Design a protein around this ligand. Sequence first.
Ligand SMILES: [K+]
Ligand SMILES: [K+]
Ligand SMILES: [K+]
Ligand SMILES: [K+]
Ligand SMILES: [K+]
Ligand SMILES: [K+]
Ligand SMILES: [K+]
Ligand SMILES: [K+]
Ligand SMILES: [K+]
Ligand SMILES: [K+]
Ligand SMILES: [K+]
Ligand SMILES: [K+]
Ligand SMILES: [K+]
Ligand SMILES: [K+]
Ligand SMILES: [K+]
Ligand SMILES: [K+]
Ligand SMILES: [Mg+2]
Ligand SMILES: [Mg+2]
Ligand SMILES: [Mg+2]
Ligand SMILES: [Mg+2]
Ligand SMILES: [Mg+2]
Ligand SMILES: [Mg+2]
Ligand SMILES: [Mg+2]
Ligand SMILES: [Mg+2]
Ligand SMILES: [Mg+2]
Ligand SMILES: [Mg+2]
Ligand SMILES: [Mg+2]
Ligand SMILES: [Mg+2]
Ligand SMILES: [Mg+2]
Ligand SMILES: [Mg+2]
Ligand SMILES: [Mg+2]
Ligand SMILES: [Mg+2]
Ligand SMILES: [Mg+2]
Ligand SMILES: [Mg+2]
Ligand SMILES: [Mg+2]
Ligand SMILES: [Mg+2]
Ligand SMILES: [Mg+2]
Ligand SMILES: [Mg+2]
Ligand SMILES: [Mg+2]
Ligand SMILES: [Mg+2]
Ligand SMILES: [Mg+2]
Ligand SMILES: [Mg+2]
Ligand SMILES: [Mg+2]
Ligand SMILES: [Mg+2]
Ligand SMILES: [Mg+2]
Ligand SMILES: [Mg+2]
Ligand SMILES: [Mg+2]
Ligand SMILES: [Mg+2]
Ligand SMILES: [Mg+2]
Ligand SMILES: [Mg+2]
Ligand SMILES: [Mg+2]
Ligand SMILES: [Mg+2]
Ligand SMILES: [Mg+2]
Ligand SMILES: [Mg+2]
Ligand SMILES: [Mg+2]
Ligand SMILES: [Mg+2]
Ligand SMILES: [Mg+2]
Ligand SMILES: [Mg+2]
Ligand SMILES: [Mg+2]
Ligand SMILES: [Mg+2]
Ligand SMILES: [Mg+2]
Ligand SMILES: [Mg+2]
Lengths: 139, 174
Amino acid sequence: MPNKRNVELLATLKENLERAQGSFFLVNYQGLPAKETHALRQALKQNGARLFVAKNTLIRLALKELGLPELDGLQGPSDPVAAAKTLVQFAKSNPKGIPQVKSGLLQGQILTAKDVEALAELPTMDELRAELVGVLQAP
Amino acid sequence: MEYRLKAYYREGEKPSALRRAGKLPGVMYNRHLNRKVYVDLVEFDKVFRQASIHHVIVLELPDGQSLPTLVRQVNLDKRRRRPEHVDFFVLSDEPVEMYVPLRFVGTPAGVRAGGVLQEIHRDILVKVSPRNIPEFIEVDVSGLEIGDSLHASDLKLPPGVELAVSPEETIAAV
RNA sequence: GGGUGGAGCAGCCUGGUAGCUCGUCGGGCUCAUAACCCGAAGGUCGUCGGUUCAAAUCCGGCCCC
RNA sequence: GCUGACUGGGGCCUGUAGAGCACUGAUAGGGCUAGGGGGCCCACCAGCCUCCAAACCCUGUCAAACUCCGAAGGGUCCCAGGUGGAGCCUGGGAGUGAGGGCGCGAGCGAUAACGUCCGCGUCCGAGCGCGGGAACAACCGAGACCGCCAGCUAAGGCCCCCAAGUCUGGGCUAAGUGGUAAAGGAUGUGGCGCCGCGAAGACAGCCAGGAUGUUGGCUUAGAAGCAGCCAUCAUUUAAAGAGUGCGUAAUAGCUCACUGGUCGAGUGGCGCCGCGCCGAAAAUGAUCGGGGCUUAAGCCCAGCGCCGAAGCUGCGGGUCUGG
RNA sequence: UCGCCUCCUAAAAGGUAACGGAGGCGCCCAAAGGUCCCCUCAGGCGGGACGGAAAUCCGCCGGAGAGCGCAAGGGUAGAAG
RNA sequence: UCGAUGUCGGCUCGUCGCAUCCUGGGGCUGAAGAAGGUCCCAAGGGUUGGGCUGUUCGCCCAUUAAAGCGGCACGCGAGCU
Ligand SMILES: [K+]
Ligand SMILES: [K+]
Ligand SMILES: [K+]
Ligand SMILES: [K+]
Ligand SMILES: [K+]
Ligand SMILES: [K+]
Ligand SMILES: [K+]
Ligand SMILES: [K+]
Ligand SMILES: [K+]
Ligand SMILES: [K+]
Ligand SMILES: [K+]
Ligand SMILES: [K+]
Ligand SMILES: [K+]
Ligand SMILES: [K+]
Ligand SMILES: [K+]
Ligand SMILES: [K+]
Ligand SMILES: [Mg+2]
Ligand SMILES: [Mg+2]
Ligand SMILES: [Mg+2]
Ligand SMILES: [Mg+2]
Ligand SMILES: [Mg+2]
Ligand SMILES: [Mg+2]
Ligand SMILES: [Mg+2]
Ligand SMILES: [Mg+2]
Ligand SMILES: [Mg+2]
Ligand SMILES: [Mg+2]
Ligand SMILES: [Mg+2]
Ligand SMILES: [Mg+2]
Ligand SMILES: [Mg+2]
Ligand SMILES: [Mg+2]
Ligand SMILES: [Mg+2]
Ligand SMILES: [Mg+2]
Ligand SMILES: [Mg+2]
Ligand SMILES: [Mg+2]
Ligand SMILES: [Mg+2]
Ligand SMILES: [Mg+2]
Ligand SMILES: [Mg+2]
Ligand SMILES: [Mg+2]
Ligand SMILES: [Mg+2]
Ligand SMILES: [Mg+2]
Ligand SMILES: [Mg+2]
Ligand SMILES: [Mg+2]
Ligand SMILES: [Mg+2]
Ligand SMILES: [Mg+2]
Ligand SMILES: [Mg+2]
Ligand SMILES: [Mg+2]
Ligand SMILES: [Mg+2]
Ligand SMILES: [Mg+2]
Ligand SMILES: [Mg+2]
Ligand SMILES: [Mg+2]
Ligand SMILES: [Mg+2]
Ligand SMILES: [Mg+2]
Ligand SMILES: [Mg+2]
Ligand SMILES: [Mg+2]
Ligand SMILES: [Mg+2]
Ligand SMILES: [Mg+2]
Ligand SMILES: [Mg+2]
Ligand SMILES: [Mg+2]
Ligand SMILES: [Mg+2]
Ligand SMILES: [Mg+2]
Ligand SMILES: [Mg+2]
Ligand SMILES: [Mg+2]
């Protein structure tokens, strides 16, 4: 029972569990289209942008284990910068070229339930929130 | 590493029956002792395949003993390659003769270009106390070039050792 | 038991290199020839596996005579 | 007239079987090295380096005419047991001097012959008288003085022919194997075993996807994986061989290496044993003695019974020989 | 092919067959015979003028493989030499 | 089996085997078709006339769907030659 050379060399490599704001992490269908989601195979020395391995490995016996415990999302089992470069790397989320790049289970640290209406399909939160200077604050 | 075999006792007991029950007869003897013994064949195999006389066996005798031994003679039935007796020689004060397997890091670490190397390759008989019992002895430095004959008077010789054979056999060849 | 440079044949035996003649080619001697004295090219030695660092040169099959 | 075959105990004699390599030779591989074998700065003539290559060094064998060893058995002598259609001695009468099969050990043969020739046993011969073997001189049982409508058994048998079990248990085979002939062959079958992967989840399948400059350098009207030689570069990786398949006016279109996914339990390989299967074609009409039989009326391991001969018992008689 | 001798076959006494295997004898020696006293091989390694693998010599080593008139076997240096 | 079992070839009459020559089935093909190649099933029937020679067998002529190989005391002389 040599038990999954992945579960040592690709058990997330015991890597990037804590790195990259160890909460909030990933979702949605390890991948349908090899026709419209490019930007692999070309970053001059390595990709480091798509996925590594093994959805099923960690979704069972990778416990809370150094993230930030929050709870609200969509369903069960099926990038470094947090909540900002969401759809600025891949997966434009319906159509994206191949329809229904659907969903998963997410939890960051504050009050996120649906998250494709508020933080996924390219919103404005760090530049459009400049409306707290004379709106609802100063007469 | 050492191994263990459970080594029951026996006096009469026509040996053809011991085979008919799956148990391998043998003998246990040394300078001060000789008794009739027999082991189970099945566990003997799983052990002796790696016991491979170079290594020591404890045999953990019934009668409360635990008697360490080196295997020295195995008469396998001429017909079917299957053993039909074991000679268990009891290690005692010091020293004995024995064979020790060799490891190879010699020249040119396997052969230069696959030409004339064709050396003498097996374990070797040594004389040593029953304590400095080496697991293997690496055939050492690889400066024995094309056509060199640096014979058995040769490599490392860990602490307990003796030229128990021809001081020069042919350890390295053409 | 034979199958070798174009023809004829030696070389196998005794396995570390295939050669004479004639033909051909060119030269020597002729006044110009014939012959003659000299070399030139060319085979891998039916073919198949093995041997050996080597075998047309050892071994055995098939082949054609 | 206790001397005999056979037997017990001893004492020496032997050179087979088996094994062995020390002699005699034969022998595979390596080492180390005369002499060749070929090659070099060549004749001072010796300078090395890798098939032959004697003796020697291990490492492995072979032998009727080799033996460092060597049983069992066999022969002989002594002391004993053995009173036997036994032994010995003298003498009278013969017949026989074509043997044969079987077992074991050989030789010739072809590790052929119901072959041939010795050896030791046995049997037919002469027991072609009796039971079994279907039938059948010599295989198994057993040495037939005669009589009996009595008994027990041997080989072999007990479903019917056909006497006695369709007897008892526990396994196996599905071929009519039994009622067969081999090298070999193979998801037949039933057991023992070993390794291999698997509940962060494997083997089936059903979901996805194998995209690069992509001309892969090189080939090349073009081979842009799939006509071929491939620097088989590496840009890598949920994954993707510049390509295992079909595709092919180079492309369009297509599939499999490989991960991931759903379902969620065993899975795939190796060896062994018992029995069976293919391999399996011959000459009038078929069949294992026949009919028939398949948890047997077939094979393997137990066991209980019974049947069964001219054998042994019983009863009666006959002679012969002892006492 | 035919008598004699040696080995094998010949199955550990003797004996044992075949157009089975493989070899010899039909002589020789007045010294090769009798006896007494002596002496020990063959090879192998070094050394040694003409001498080489060897002629003869010295050294050490060498339990019998030499020799025993001729085949083979048995025997044999504590002699048969 | 020698107080006999007539030895080859032909003729006549056959019959049986199948390891099939043709005919009817069939698989694979480097099977386009046609026509073959090869292996499988199949013994029901069929399987020619001539020249040569004692011949069997062969080799030829002309044909054919094809000119099958064996067994039967190399079938068959109380049937013939
Ligand atoms: K007596
Ligand atoms: K005796
Ligand atoms: K020897
Ligand atoms: K008489
Ligand atoms: K007899
Ligand atoms: K008799
Ligand atoms: K049957
Ligand atoms: K004298
Ligand atoms: K008669
Ligand atoms: K006759
Ligand atoms: K056909
Ligand atoms: K027919
Ligand atoms: K003829
Ligand atoms: K016929
Ligand atoms: K007649
Ligand atoms: K006739
Ligand atoms: Mg006696
Ligand atoms: Mg023997
Ligand atoms: Mg012998
Ligand atoms: Mg002894
Ligand atoms: Mg007496
Ligand atoms: Mg008498
Ligand atoms: Mg006579
Ligand atoms: Mg006679
Ligand atoms: Mg006779
Ligand atoms: Mg006789
Ligand atoms: Mg007799
Ligand atoms: Mg027997
Ligand atoms: Mg006879
Ligand atoms: Mg016989
Ligand atoms: Mg015989
Ligand atoms: Mg006769
Ligand atoms: Mg008679
Ligand atoms: Mg009769
Ligand atoms: Mg009978
Ligand atoms: Mg009878
Ligand atoms: Mg009889
Ligand atoms: Mg009587
Ligand atoms: Mg009875
Ligand atoms: Mg009985
Ligand atoms: Mg009855
Ligand atoms: Mg019953
Ligand atoms: Mg049958
Ligand atoms: Mg699967
Ligand atoms: Mg039963
Ligand atoms: Mg009476
Ligand atoms: Mg009488
Ligand atoms: Mg004798
Ligand atoms: Mg005898
Ligand atoms: Mg000498
Ligand atoms: Mg001698
Ligand atoms: Mg008559
Ligand atoms: Mg008559
Ligand atoms: Mg047929
Ligand atoms: Mg047809
Ligand atoms: Mg056609
Ligand atoms: Mg005419
Ligand atoms: Mg005529
Ligand atoms: Mg005709
Ligand atoms: Mg005939
Ligand atoms: Mg005949
Ligand atoms: Mg006739």
